[PDB]
Amino acid sequence: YIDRGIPYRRGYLLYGPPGCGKSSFITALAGELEHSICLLSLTDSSLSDDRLNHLLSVAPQQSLVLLEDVDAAFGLLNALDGVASTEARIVFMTTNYIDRLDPALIRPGRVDLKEYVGYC
Amino acid sequence: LAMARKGAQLGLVAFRRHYMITLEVPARDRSYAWLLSWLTRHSTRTQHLSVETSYLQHESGRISTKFEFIPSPGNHFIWYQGKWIRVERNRDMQMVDLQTGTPWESVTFTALGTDRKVFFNILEEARALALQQEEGKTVMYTAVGSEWRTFGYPRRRRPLDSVVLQQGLADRIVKDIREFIDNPKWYIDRGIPYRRGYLLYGPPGCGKSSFITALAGELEHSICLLSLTDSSLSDDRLNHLLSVAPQQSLVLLEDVDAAFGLLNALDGVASTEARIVFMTTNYIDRLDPALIRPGRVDLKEYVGYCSHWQLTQMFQRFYPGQAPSLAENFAEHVLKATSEISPAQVQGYFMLYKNDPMGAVHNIESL
Amino acid sequence: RTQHLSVETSYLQHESGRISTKFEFIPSPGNHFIWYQGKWIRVERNRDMQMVDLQTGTPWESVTFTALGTD
Amino acid sequence: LAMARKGAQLGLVAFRRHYMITLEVPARDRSYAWLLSWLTRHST
């Protein structure tokens, strides 16, 4: 990645109905490959946008950042990427309804992969 | 009677040794470890050995052990260029060393001859293995309140040739900086402030900031950046910030067009040594006309939409070992089908074909 | 031409991850001889087990010049 | 006279040992405990 002038970043985004085991699967994958995780809820009044940028910029090493219920939010379109690209800043974003999603959350660089988990 | 003289003859032959034998002695201060790690790779059959571990226990409960091997106490023998060299790793009861909490652990090299040009090269070749491992990071800084702070952790410097602009700009800029930095005495004598600021301009999404941080990582400097589109910043504050920038660093100013005291704040009595400045902009039309005269803004360059050589170098750098004529035709197709493009948009369009060269060159018309 | 030598380094590690090593060379413990203006002068760099020197955390390391004459 | 030479012959045979015998030495730093817990399970 470094040679070809691309930021070291590859974010996924899961979506599906509620009560499917999403967060369980994420923390399981985190425990599998010897990483830690930090989660933040977007439905928190104390959070600000510039604050969010400062938070996601300085995430600790060897960790995945988790964003729950992104549908109820919308700067994130700008805050996901920046000059503050720390090494190995993977991101996970989960959602209960894909219909509310913005159309610019699938292009590469911001959101690499997309998958659908749902009824059995 | 004869005994005192036995001791005397031995005392006399001891002095004769000094003018033929050579020695060398560290004292457990920042050359022990280097000069004993070098003493492993040279022989590799060295019995009489010993151990040193490293066990740091990262966050997240990870464990990152290793081993590092050393020659034991006692004596050893080795064969450098022409001579035989004898090592003693002496260790004693002179132990109370609170600088390290452990015993003394002297090393001593000894050998014959008079040419002391041997042990010097030993030190140097040990310094080689000592220094080659650690890779120079590139620390970032950021403004808060009225001070600079270590925003984030260190990073991996990209190579200078990582991004590529229009042909010539990189070598030109780095040559100018090399001239400005290598010869400082040229400036102090002639009563000129030690300052030489550039200013880039062009369209958005061209790789400007990437090129700046790359150049910073190339020539062993750090950088601090400040955004002018910040309400917390004041003008007198800005003066205090830019006055007290740390040593061996470039200051970066993003989006100067949306600002306008800076006309006065760029220069002052507060000229610290080696206060280089970089200023980037998306539209040159909004610029004030007094941002080109020497002393304030030395050089000016234009980076923008791509060319023939640029896309070829991009395509050649992405995939190694493919048809060069294929990449030439790729750039030709992009040029004839697209009147203008950016490195950002081409990077985006080109990322969709990971390790699919033939695909990427067959799928041109999507633009 | 002073054989019987020893070493002292400096390794400070500036900010920005820079490294600024060097070397500085010293005469070893034991004895040495030298030739100033007219006389022969004898050096001893004596070092002992009188070691507990918390002002520096290391041993004592006395230097002594000696020579003849009265001037 | 013969004594200094007894010591000398012993000093000479001591060097011969170095090229046939092998050694290994820790120093109470993050391998003592491991390398002595292993030394229990092996013999019993």
Side-chain angles (χ1 to χ4, degrees):
Chain A
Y1 266 70
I2 52 171
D3 292 311
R4 303 183 195 203
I6 293 166
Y8 204 68
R9 191 196 303 146
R10 189 188 205 93
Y12 309 150
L13 192 142
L14 307 181
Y15 71 99
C20 196
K22 294 181 180 176
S23 306
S24 179
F25 172 56
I26 297 296
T27 185
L29 192 142
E32 172 49 43
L33 56 83
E34 289 294 32
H35 286 178
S36 68
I37 57 179
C38 80
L39 60 87
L40 60 95
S41 282
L42 269 168
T43 73
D44 190 311
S45 48
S46 298
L47 175 77
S48 157
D49 303 6
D50 171 74
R51 205 172 94 189
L52 178 144
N53 188 283
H54 187 203
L55 313 173
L56 172 145
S57 60
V58 71
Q61 288 182 335
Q62 296 275 50
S63 68
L64 314 173
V65 309
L66 194 78
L67 286 92
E68 271 186 358
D69 305 51
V70 76
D71 65 328
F74 175 50
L76 179 75
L77 73 173
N78 175 41
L80 192 144
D81 54 351
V83 185
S85 54
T86 313
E87 309 307 330
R89 190 184 79 71
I90 308 167
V91 56
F92 276 97
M93 299 166 71
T94 175
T95 306
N96 300 259
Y97 322 95
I98 192 160
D99 311 298
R100 280 76 174 279
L101 272 290
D102 315 331
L105 301 171
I106 294 159
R107 64 206 293 251
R110 299 182 177 179
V111 189
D112 190 295
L113 184 60
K114 178 173 71 173
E115 283 290 355
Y116 161 58
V117 61
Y119 292 81
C120 305
Chain B
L1 71 167
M3 231 122 127
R5 325 295 303 299
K6 294 274 244 173
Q9 320 328 322
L10 295 172
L12 199 44
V13 305
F15 271 128
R16 182 73 269 179
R17 296 291 93 183
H18 159 274
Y19 278 109
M20 288 173 162
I21 283 164
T22 175
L23 204 64
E24 194 263 12
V25 175
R28 194 201 168 96
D29 285 318
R30 282 281 181 194
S31 300
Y32 189 105
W34 303 353
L35 184 47
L36 277 188
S37 187
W38 178 93
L39 210 64
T40 292
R41 299 276 269 280
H42 183 226
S43 303
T44 67
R45 288 183 295 178
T46 290
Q47 305 103 318
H48 276 206
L49 73 163
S50 65
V51 184
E52 185 172 3
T53 44
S54 60
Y55 173 83
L56 57 93
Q57 194 163 26
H58 283 304
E59 286 286 312
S60 89
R62 189 182 170 83
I63 307 185
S64 292
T65 191
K66 220 194 175 58
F67 281 122
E68 196 178 11
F69 278 60
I70 297 168
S72 96
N75 306 332
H76 297 328
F77 284 71
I78 54 176
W79 188 89
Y80 200 52
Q81 292 170 352
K83 316 186 162 45
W84 282 353
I85 292 155
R86 152 168 203 278
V87 177
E88 300 186 353
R89 185 179 165 198
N90 191 3
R91 171 151 74 189
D92 299 328
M93 71 199 172
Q94 282 176 4
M95 71 184 304
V96 188
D97 303 315
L98 276 294
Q99 66 170 1
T100 187
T102 80
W104 195 38
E105 309 213 325
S106 296
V107 177
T108 72
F109 287 94
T110 190
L112 309 190
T114 74
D115 338 279
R116 69 206 192 73
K117 290 170 285 199
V118 175
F119 306 146
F120 279 48
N121 290 333
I122 292 281
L123 272 299
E124 201 73 0
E125 277 194 349
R127 182 183 169 278
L129 308 187
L131 190 69
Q132 208 183 41
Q133 295 183 353
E134 173 49 273
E135 285 288 358
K137 314 304 187 84
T138 298
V139 68
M140 208 88 71
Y141 284 145
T142 307
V144 72
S146 298
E147 274 286 8
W148 300 111
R149 287 257 303 290
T150 80
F151 172 75
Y153 295 148
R155 305 187 178 188
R156 317 209 70 177
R157 59 182 62 179
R158 322 191 197 176
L160 181 71
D161 303 359
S162 305
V163 70
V164 59
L165 311 176
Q166 212 286 333
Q167 172 50 281
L169 298 169
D171 283 317
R172 193 189 298 183
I173 292 162
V174 70
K175 187 173 78 98
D176 211 318
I177 284 288
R178 291 269 202 195
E179 189 176 58
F180 179 70
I181 187 61
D182 276 346
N183 300 344
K185 180 53 152 43
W186 194 98
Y187 266 70
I188 52 171
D189 292 311
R190 303 183 195 203
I192 293 166
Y194 204 68
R195 191 196 303 146
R196 189 188 205 93
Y198 309 150
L199 192 142
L200 307 181
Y201 71 99
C206 195
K208 294 180 180 176
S209 306
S210 179
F211 172 56
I212 297 296
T213 185
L215 192 142
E218 172 49 43
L219 56 83
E220 289 294 32
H221 286 178
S222 68
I223 57 179
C224 80
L225 60 87
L226 60 95
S227 282
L228 269 168
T229 73
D230 190 311
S231 48
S232 298
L233 175 77
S234 157
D235 303 6
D236 171 74
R237 205 172 94 189
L238 178 144
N239 188 283
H240 187 203
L241 313 173
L242 172 145
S243 60
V244 71
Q247 288 182 335
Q248 296 275 50
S249 68
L250 314 173
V251 309
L252 194 78
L253 286 92
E254 271 186 358
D255 305 51
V256 76
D257 65 328
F260 175 50
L262 179 75
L263 73 173
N264 175 41
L266 192 144
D267 54 351
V269 185
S271 54
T272 313
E273 309 307 330
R275 190 184 79 71
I276 308 167
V277 56
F278 276 97
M279 299 166 71
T280 175
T281 306
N282 299 259
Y283 322 95
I284 192 160
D285 311 298
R286 280 76 174 278
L287 272 290
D288 315 331
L291 301 171
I292 294 159
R293 64 206 293 251
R296 299 182 177 179
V297 189
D298 190 294
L299 184 60
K300 178 173 71 173
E301 283 290 355
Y302 161 58
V303 61
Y305 292 81
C306 305
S307 87
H308 181 280
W309 196 68
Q310 195 165 359
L311 284 84
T312 31
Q313 191 69 2
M314 269 181 191
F315 202 104
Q316 176 57 22
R317 189 70 65 78
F318 196 88
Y319 316 101
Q322 288 76 19
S325 315
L326 193 68
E328 283 149 313
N329 197 351
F330 173 88
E332 169 43 20
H333 265 77
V334 173
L335 182 46
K336 56 137 185 174
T338 78
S339 41
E340 74 290 55
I341 50 162
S342 158
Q345 299 203 345
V346 71
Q347 273 283 14
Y349 173 72
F350 202 87
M351 201 174 184
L352 298 169
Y353 293 86
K354 296 280 170 182
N355 214 312
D356 314 296
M358 295 174 193
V361 59
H362 292 193
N363 308 126
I364 314 307
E365 195 63 304
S366 183
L367 271 298
Chain C
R1 288 183 295 178
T2 290
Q3 305 103 318
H4 276 206
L5 73 163
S6 65
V7 184
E8 185 172 3
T9 44
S10 60
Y11 173 83
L12 57 93
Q13 194 163 26
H14 283 304
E15 286 286 312
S16 89
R18 189 182 170 83
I19 307 185
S20 292
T21 191
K22 220 194 175 58
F23 281 122
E24 196 178 11
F25 278 60
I26 297 168
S28 96
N31 306 332
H32 297 328
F33 284 71
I34 54 176
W35 188 89
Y36 200 52
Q37 292 170 352
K39 316 186 162 45
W40 282 353
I41 292 154
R42 152 168 203 278
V43 177
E44 300 186 353
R45 185 179 165 198
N46 191 3
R47 172 151 74 189
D48 299 328
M49 71 199 172
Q50 282 176 4
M51 71 184 304
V52 188
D53 303 315
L54 276 294
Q55 66 170 1
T56 187
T58 80
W60 195 38
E61 309 213 325
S62 296
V63 177
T64 72
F65 287 94
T66 190
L68 309 190
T70 74
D71 338 279
Chain D
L1 71 167
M3 231 122 127
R5 325 295 303 299
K6 294 274 244 173
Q9 320 328 322
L10 295 172
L12 199 44
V13 305
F15 271 128
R16 182 73 269 179
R17 296 291 93 183
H18 159 274
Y19 278 109
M20 288 173 162
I21 283 164
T22 175
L23 204 64
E24 194 263 12
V25 175
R28 194 201 168 96
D29 285 318
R30 282 280 181 194
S31 300
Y32 189 105
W34 303 353
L35 184 47
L36 277 188
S37 187
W38 178 93
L39 210 64
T40 292
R41 299 276 269 280
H42 183 226
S43 303
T44 67

